[PDB]
């Protein structure tokens, strides 16, 4: 998915 927002290592949304 391209709606992916990553804040940090192993911390992701969508």
């Amino acid at each position, epitope marked *: 998915t391209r709606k992916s927002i990553h804040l*940090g290592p192993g*911390r992701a949304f969508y």
Partner: antibody, heavy 124, light 114 residues
Framework: EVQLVESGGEVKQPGQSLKISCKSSGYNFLDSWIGWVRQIPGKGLEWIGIIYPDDSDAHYSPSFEGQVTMSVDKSISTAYLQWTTLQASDTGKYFC?????????????????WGQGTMILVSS | SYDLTQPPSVSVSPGQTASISCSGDKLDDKYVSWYYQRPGQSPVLLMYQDFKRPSGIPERLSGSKSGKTATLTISGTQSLDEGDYYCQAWDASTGGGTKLTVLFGDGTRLTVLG
């Protein structure tokens, strides 16, 4: 090319409403988040919001939520920022920007591509 | 919710390496990005995921991290580099339900004394 092209400068009297635009081209508009950042003259960048064109999922800065509204029109690849009622303190330069997904063992995001900025002046 | 702190100004002579720090509460488990803005122009992305350079950004700019502090290093600093630099990360607070936020630093004015 691959760009974000914003609409022109605006001069408004307080209490007027306004809708500024951000036309993407050169990539799939639906599939990356659009951000919006404001910068008052000679100050830093201020987050306003992000919105996902594909479905219009949105997140706002608590500083702007309900003061201003994000939207898109996929039919024309445009993002929009809308005020119902302008105020002196809305004066500033507004940028739209695309969040890029950098992929790999480590995936991240960052705002790679930026509009040229829309200036807004609210004056009587 | 937390805030990113950068020093408001830095001054360097042509050639000296310039260093810009960025601190914040959860920075160590958070990817930091860095942006350049020349006044009157649009921001430019210099650095994402702490240390990775977008295609086109030159090698003399490098990103690093230690504890809650991100740093941007500019070497071979020349006048064209003059302007404002901003760090940015994300915050996700429950507050139930997840509230997303883009965090900017206050920005750092670099002067090169030529």
């Amino acid at each position: 090319e691959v760009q974000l092209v914003e609409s022109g400068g605006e001069v408004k009297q307080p209490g007027q409403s306004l809708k500024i635009s951000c036309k993407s081209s050169g990539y799939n508009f639906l599939d990356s988040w659009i951000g919006w950042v404001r910068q008052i003259p000679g100050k830093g960048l201020e987050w306003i919001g992000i919105i996902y064109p594909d479905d219009s999922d949105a997140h706002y800065s608590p500083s702007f939520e309900g003061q201003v509204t994000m939207s898109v029109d996929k039919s024309i690849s445009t993002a929009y920022l809308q005020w119902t009622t302008l105020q002196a303190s809305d004066t500033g330069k507004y940028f739209c920007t695309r969040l890029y997904l950098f992929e790999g063992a480590q995936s991240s995001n960052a705002f790679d591509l930026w509009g040229q900025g829309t200036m807004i002046l609210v004056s009587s | 919710s937390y805030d990113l702190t950068q020093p408001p100004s830095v001054s360097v002579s042509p050639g000296q390496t310039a260093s810009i720090s960025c601190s914040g509460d959860k920075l160590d488990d958070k990817y930091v990005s860095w942006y350049y803005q020349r006044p009157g122009q649009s921001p430019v992305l210099l650095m994402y995921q702490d240390f990775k350079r977008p295609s086109g950004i030159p090698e003399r700019l490098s990103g690093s991290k230690s504890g809650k502090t991100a740093t941007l290093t500019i070497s071979g600093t020349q006048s064209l580099d003059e302007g404002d630099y901003y760090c940015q990360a994300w915050d996700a607070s429950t507050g139930g339900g997840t509230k997303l936020t883009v965090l900017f630093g206050d920005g750092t004015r670099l002067t090169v004394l030529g």
